[PDB]
Structure 1
């Protein structure tokens, strides 16, 4: 037979932080593996796609 009822209130503001995106990197797989090398690039082609 007992209830607690609030008699006053407070307005609070909280901050919620969420990631939305990540850096749009791009890597040139040929230049990374065989940078400026014809001999290496031709070998790389043997790996297809």
Structure 2
């Protein structure tokens, strides 16, 4: 008899600045005043990986 079980998922990474603001100095300088919302969004995905 056969039994199948998953063990792992594909691991991904995101760039906060590239996704949110593209390549733009004004958007980047405006994203610094929203805090650590994507410094903290990187550790989670790194731990999952």
- TM-score normalised by length of structure 1: 0.65
Choose between structure 1 and 2: higher strand proportion.
1
Runs of 4 or more above 6 Å deviation: none
Considering only aligned residues, what root-mean-square deviation do their CA atoms show, in Å? 0.8
Choose between structure 1 and 2: higher helix proportion.
2
Stretches of structure 2 lacking an aligned partner (at least 5 in a row): 37-49
Which residue of the partner structure matches residue 8 of structure 2? Answer: 21
Stretches of structure 1 lacking an aligned partner (at least 5 in a row): 1-13
- TM-score normalised by length of structure 2: 0.65
Indicate the structure whose relative CO is greater, using CA pairs within 8 Å and at least 6 residues apart: 2
